[PDB]
Amino acid sequence: FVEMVDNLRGKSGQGYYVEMTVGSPPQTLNILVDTGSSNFAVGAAPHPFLHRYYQRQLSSTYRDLRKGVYVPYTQGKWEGELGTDLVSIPHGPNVTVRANIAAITESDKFFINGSNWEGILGLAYAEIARPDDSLEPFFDSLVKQTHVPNLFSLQLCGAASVGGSMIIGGIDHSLYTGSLWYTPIRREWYYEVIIVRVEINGQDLKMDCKEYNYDKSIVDSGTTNLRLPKKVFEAAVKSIKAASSTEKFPDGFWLGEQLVCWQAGTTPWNIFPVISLYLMGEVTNQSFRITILPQQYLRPVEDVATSQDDCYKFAISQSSTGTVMGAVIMEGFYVVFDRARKRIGFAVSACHVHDEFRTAAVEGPFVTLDMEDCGYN
Ligand SMILES: Nc1ncccc1NCc1cccc(-c2cccnc2)c1
Numbered sequence: 001f002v003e004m005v006d007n008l009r010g011k012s013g014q015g016y017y018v019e020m021t022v023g024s025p026p027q028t029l030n031i032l033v034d035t036g037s038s039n040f041a042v043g044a045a046p047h048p049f050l051h052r053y054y055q056r057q058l059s060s061t062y063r064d065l066r067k068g069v070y071v072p073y074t075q076g077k078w079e080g081e082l083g084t085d086l087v088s089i090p091h092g093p094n095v096t097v098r099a100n101i102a103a104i105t106e107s108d109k110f111f112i113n114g115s116n117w118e119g120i121l122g123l124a125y126a127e128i129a130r131p132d133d134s135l136e137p138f139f140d141s142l143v144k145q146t147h148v149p150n151l152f153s154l155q156l157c158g159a160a161s162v163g164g165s166m167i168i169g170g171i172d173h174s175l176y177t178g179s180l181w182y183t184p185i186r187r188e189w190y191y192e193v194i195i196v197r198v199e200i201n202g203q204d205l206k207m208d209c210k211e212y213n214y215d216k217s218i219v220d221s222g223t224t225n226l227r228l229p230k231k232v233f234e235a236a237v238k239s240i241k242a243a244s245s246t247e248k249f250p251d252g253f254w255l256g257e258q259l260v261c262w263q264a265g266t267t268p269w270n271i272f273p274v275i276s277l278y279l280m281g282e283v284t285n286q287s288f289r290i291t292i293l294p295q296q297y298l299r300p301v302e303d304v305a306t307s308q309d310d311c312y313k314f315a316i317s318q319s320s321t322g323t324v325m326g327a328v329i330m331e332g333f334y335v336v337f338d339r340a341r342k343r344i345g346f347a348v349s350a351c352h353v354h355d356e357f358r359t360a361a362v363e364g365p366f367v368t369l370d371m372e373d374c375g376y377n
Contacts, residue, residue, distance in 0.1 A: 001172040007091035008033065008156070008164035009116070012302065013224055016156055016164050016327075017117035021088045022101060023059025028052070028090075030117040033154070033166055034222035035191050035337065036324075038129040039071065040087075040138040041078060042119030044103030049111040052118050056103055061086045069102050071130045076109030078102075082135070092168045097145045099138045123152070123221075123337070127189040139339070142168075150340040154221060156331045157351035160302060164351075176334035176347035181288040181362050183279035185342045186375060190218040193344060195323060196287050196371045197278035198232070200239040207235060209374035216322035216376060219335065219344060223326030225256075226275075226297060227319035236275070236316065243273040256317050259301050261309040269294055269355055277325075280371045281364060282343065287371060288364030290346050295353045296332050322376075332360055 008016040009030075017030045022042065029042055029052055043053040056062045065082040080102045087099045104110075104119070111118075126133040126140065136144075143150045148169040155175040156164040165175060186192040195212040198205040214229050228236060237254050247268070252258035262268070272294030278287045299315040315328045332352050336345030346362045 001167050001170055004091055004167050005165045005172065005175075006163055008166055010158060010162040010164075011115060012158070012160040012162060014112050014115045015117065015222060016158070016162060018092070018121065018166055019090050020121070021090060022054055023056070023085050024061040026088065027054060027059065029054065029119055031119045031121045032117045032222065033123065034120050035123045035154075036218065036220035036222040037120065037122035038124045038126060038137045039069070039102055039120070039122045039135070040099055041069075041071070041080065041102035041104055041122070043111065044080060045105050047107065047111055049113045049115070050118050051116060054101070054103055054119070056083060056085070059085055065100075067131075069131050073109070076107070078104045078107040078110045080104040080106070087138070089168065092166070093146070093148050095142070095146045095148060097141050099141045100135055120222075124190050125188040151336065151338045153334060153336040153345075154330065155334050155349055155351060156221070156327055157349070158331065159300070171336055171345075175350050177350055178348050178362060180334075180336065180345045180347040181364055182282050182336075182338065182343040182345045183288075184282065185344060188342070190216065190220070191337060191344060193217050193219060193325075194280040194371065194375050195277050196280050196368045196374045197289075198236070199276040199278075199289075200236065201243060201273040202276070203239075205232070205235050205239065207232060210376060212323060213374055213376050214322060217325070218322065219325045219330070221327065221330060223324045224315065224328060225324070225326050226292070226316045226328045227324035227326060228316060229322060230318050230320065232323070233316070233318040240273055244271045246271050253314055256314055259304070259311040259313055261307065261311040264308055264310050267298075267310050267312070270357070272298060274358060278366060278368065279346070280368075280374070283365070285367055285369055285371070286364070287366045287368040288362065289366065290333060291361040291363070292329060292332055293353070293355045293358060293360050295355060296328055299328070333362065
């Protein structure tokens, strides 16, 4: 896996991407790594934001499936033509598979102006693939056609340029410290998990644990923030404010719309609480917890011209679609998507940012009863 270490790049807030090659002769592309979707879709036309795009007609191995796709979002979309072609990952395993590829021919509010990726690698399951679940996702093809084990792991680091590792087919011990603990994947669609308890500086937020997963909780490398359901978000914000009473901040800061600034080197990290998410464990009545330091949810904000303070935005935001463990969370941990065994592992990342006195942790076991009732139906 030393060949795979450090194989991801990005820019602050624009995701992590991995290099891939498609077609014969091979066309090199940078592809966003997204555990929140299940299509492999690449720019196939010269949208002005793109550095590179897939040219299907130059590939001797391209096969047109004579079928279109349309993926809408709340405001945007992408649309394109379905096909298959040969695909490799230069800094992944030494194999070449025939995968489905959506050739993006028209899009709106999908690509990011300024980014250095040109497609998306959806790593979640068939159930949420478009146009329907018969369009086999990339990883399913990799596993079906090769001897690569049915798992990948992600160490997201980064800081501005970011870096990380996607270890395909295994776990790399050098990428984490302490122990790996596993939560069940509740259902194979998104990487759905169940959060069973939440503490702030060790103190229970005291909500019905169903609130934590209303209407789902997912691990999503294609979202930056920790996103929390509205009722959970308000309790957490209330509790973080209290812990940090010592200073007052604008309403807008808690909304992600305003920064908070301190003289360089004087950020009062001590007044911001650690957040603990307890996840359903592998054994009946057993759970474990992952601990988030504030340097994960207080996000440094690049350059406000002639300001030599340290300025930060709040990287916890509200969700109406359940809890989302986005890059903010994932950057604290080495995360193992153990598809073969329907489970997701967490261990403290070897590249997590340190606090002067407090230590991130993945710890257990804890006794939590009725953990199934925490799941939303
Ligand atoms: N996984 C995911 N979660 C929320 C929204 C979108 C999404 N995936 C598709 C997608 C499309 C375009 C850009 C991005 C993106 C933008 C910024 C950071 N990471 C991913 C994600």
